[PDB]
Design a protein around this nucleic acid. Sequence first.
RNA 1: GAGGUAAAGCGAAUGAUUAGAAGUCUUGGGGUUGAAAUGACCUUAACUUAUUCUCAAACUUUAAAUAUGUAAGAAGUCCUUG
RNA 2: CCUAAGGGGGACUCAUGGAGAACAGAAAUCUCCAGUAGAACAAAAGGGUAAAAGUCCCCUUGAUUUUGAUUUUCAGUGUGAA
RNA 3: GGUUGCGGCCAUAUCUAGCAGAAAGCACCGUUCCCCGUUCGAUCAACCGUAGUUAAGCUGCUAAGAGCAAUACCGAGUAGUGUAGUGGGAGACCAUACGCGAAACUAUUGUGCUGCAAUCU
Lengths: 159, 208, 172, 33, 292
Amino acid sequence: GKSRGYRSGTRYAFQRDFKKHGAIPLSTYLKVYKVGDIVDIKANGSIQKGMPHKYYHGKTGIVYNVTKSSVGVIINKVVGNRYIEKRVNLRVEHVKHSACRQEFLNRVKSNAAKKREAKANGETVYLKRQAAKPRGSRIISTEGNIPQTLAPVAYETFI
Amino acid sequence: ARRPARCYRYCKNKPYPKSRYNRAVPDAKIRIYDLGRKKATVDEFPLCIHLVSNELEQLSSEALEAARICANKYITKVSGRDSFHLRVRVHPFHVLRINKMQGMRGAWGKPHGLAARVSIGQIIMSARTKDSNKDVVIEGLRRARYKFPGQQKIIISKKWGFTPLNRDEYIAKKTNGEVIDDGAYVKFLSRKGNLEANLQQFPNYQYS
Amino acid sequence: SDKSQNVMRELRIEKLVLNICVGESGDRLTRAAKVLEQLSGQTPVQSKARYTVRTFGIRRNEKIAVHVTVRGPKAEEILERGLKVKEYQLRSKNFSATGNFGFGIDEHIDLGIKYDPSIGIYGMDFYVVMGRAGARVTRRKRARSTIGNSHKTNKEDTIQWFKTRYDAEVLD
Amino acid sequence: PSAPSREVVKKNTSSKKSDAAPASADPAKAKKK
Amino acid sequence: MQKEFRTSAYHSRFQTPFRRRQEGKTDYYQRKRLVTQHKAKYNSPKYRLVVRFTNKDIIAQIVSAHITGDVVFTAAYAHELPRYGIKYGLTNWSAAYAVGLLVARRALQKLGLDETYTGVEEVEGEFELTEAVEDGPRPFKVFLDIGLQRTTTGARVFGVLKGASDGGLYVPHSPNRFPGWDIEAEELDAELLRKYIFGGHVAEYMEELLDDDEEKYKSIFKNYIEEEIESEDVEEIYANAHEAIRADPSFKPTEKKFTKEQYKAESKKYRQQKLTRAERQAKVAKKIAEFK
RNA sequence: GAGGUAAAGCGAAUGAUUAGAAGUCUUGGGGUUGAAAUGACCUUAACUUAUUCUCAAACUUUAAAUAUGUAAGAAGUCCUUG
RNA sequence: CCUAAGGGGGACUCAUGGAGAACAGAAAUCUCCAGUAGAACAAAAGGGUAAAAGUCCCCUUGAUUUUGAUUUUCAGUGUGAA
RNA sequence: GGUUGCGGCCAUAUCUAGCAGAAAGCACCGUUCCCCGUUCGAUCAACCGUAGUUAAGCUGCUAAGAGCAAUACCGAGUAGUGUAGUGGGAGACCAUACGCGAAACUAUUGUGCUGCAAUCU
């Protein structure tokens, strides 16, 4: 007999972290979520109300609704050959702001600051990020660092 | 009763131990893992000789018992029962299953026996003895090798007895008062914890 | 500082607990409760058996014993009234490692109360809980903590205090 | 008279024999023989 | 015979509670219920009336919670009462009422809701909630946080409750925990509550004790004796103070006899300092040597 | 961001498991003390302490590789105020 | 299966071990200390829970009314459940 | 800098055993008329701040302390693993090529930081 209940296979996913059981620290309840915020979903096993399904554990989405104790998050899930928009109601204990927003929102500010200064100096600045390039030429000094010769070592048993 | 060992030679299944899920499991044929003068102190037997696996393989408890008996018999016959301490280093914890004892319907087997799953380089049997008793103990293990399937190597250890220290580091820690007897084994000095207890337990500790 | 001869380190009785474990429920337990209310002047409380034992003739949640807690001067008076029956002689194996001691009388009329044939005689159990000032730390709701090692009550201090305050003997 | 009762603090809901109550764990009360 | 319990594995796997729970000071269940705000009232904070009693002081604070820590809006302490004319019994039920009234008036002064939301100017002990004025800002809403202190009818925390409510703050509450509440006949005897507001119970104890046990009266009510304060003029001490509290509820900090730097320099002299790694290494070497 | 598989671990929890050593028996027996004292001794077996060999699909503090969610702007960012 | 074993609030801390108290002993009741949960939570197993979700006490019927949205199984149909 | 009230992170904060603590605070501490709760004013309630004490709590310091945390020419580029071959080997398995890369272990260091308000020799 197969069993396919709602929380099947969540033995380790919904467990609390080691030495982290019990009450929720209240910064979780002091965070403010606005429509359009990007949030990570991670089910807290100790709060069983407003709990996400195991599919959304580890997914990231857009807040579309804000209620008394919960947020509505939009998730795109693959069903066959397309994506379906899923609307999940989650209590804020299972939700955290995505840290990818704060990094990109800082690059927007930095680009704006760099661009305005270049206009003040009448010069140009390039704001596109670049991949790591192959390193240039260089000269290796050997004063105090004369090359040491290594050889493969013979076989030994150490038991 | 017993199928030929070739039917259970390879680690094809996941480990299947006794648990709350399989309970009607027979006992292993091997019950004794330490033989000879197992109460000898560490300083009495400096030489260690291993029987080492060159195989990823399963060894039945029957083979472990047979090899243990063969090695023990030979070494006690040639050098005496108190000239060595033999230790079997693998315990059979994996349960083999038998089906016949319809067709393929409902074919989940019943417990049939026990086997130890050994890797390459895994020590099967260890024998601590005196140096002068090398050729005997080796010949004791070389016979026991015949009771096992696959390839095994007889390797003379670099270490003092069953200790993790080389035969030179042990002497250094011994003349420095960092080793005390614990019966058949020893305790080593620690530079951590209560200083007074450490000093009391190792009075001959020449601190540097 | 850290003076052992400090005013607040004074040993004194916290409470005296009087136990009568009559093995049954009904008239005998009610009369034992009457005896306890007579001795202490306080309404006692009945204890129920935690589980069933056929050998002892008790069953779970059957009201078996009755006990009462007295504190203050009345505890001291009852304690010395009970020590009179013991003729002021306890044993070294009557004091716990935590500094408490107890004894047991065998007839409750030796204490000095009127005897009634209807009531009969009940034995009685005496236990004294010793403690210095500041035990409220371990019993208050907010900022509850534990008592420091030097401030703890132990067997030797309680034995010496008992010998001094009552001129009695602790038979080692 | 009033009849207050001692309240329940334990959680053992089972109505059975308790832990560590075995025979032969006791000494010989008649060892003096 | 028995296993030693405090093993290294016991300490390794032990999960210590929250720092302020192990201190036995914060009930985080109640704190979560008090602090958490409706998520659609995004950054609007909930304001708590923190009321704490020490052996000598009454602390009343108006607090809003934030991620970096709680932020005090205003605070009134009982040791501020001597400025207003109450010098003794700084932990009465009436001192609690005075502290609540003071914190309410001070908060309303800080906000600007003084002329609007005056409160109960004629304290008769009737149960009443600060009702909003039509076509005007709503009254400052504050929730009572009594912490770990038990809820009993007649407790002093509800004295601060009644004072703050009468001071003009909107603090939701019921009158069934006030002194003078008849639980059998579910109505509040406002006469006894008014008695408690103006120190009536203390004055009655003074009068009842003076004619029965004069020696105990001399020790318990010393300060009143050397102040020539009798029972009949106890009430005015509170009755005037209320008025005075309403006249100037602004906070006046105590003038400090020393500066912050002087306090720090003085205190730093009596603070032991951690041994350097070399110092304890030398101690270990010496202890080894003296062991031979 | 999420994960608990490979590996690893077991002088870390749970469960399994080999060997001694040192202590306590006061809440184990046999024998030997006693004309009786439960108050010693020899022993095995128990526990306790610090160690020791070996393990787990339905054990685990830790914990990959591969695979997987989101973001990388004009429907954006900032300023003022309906 | 449950008028509480549902709902709210309050108070308390569990399993177990050690040391003590007449009968009383390995197991009755009382006291202190230790006690990260080794207990309990109707019923399988897993997860969760300690000033509680456990134990006890007080009050109750939100196990009510109206009809939408959403998650799982999914065809993104029904039913069940949330 | 100390202390209190309310906190954030939730042991670098816990645990064991010692020692010290000026000022204020906190605390223990005293009492039972009143509101209130108990077998018990022990807890809870109220009253006095008066009679006393730093003994305890609390705070800090000590320990080749237990635990915890961090780091690393520690182990180890090891174990494992993605990709590849008409590679080896009877097989079990193994080596090599292009990549990713642990855990234990070992050693060293550390042992709460901090926000708002009030207060203090």
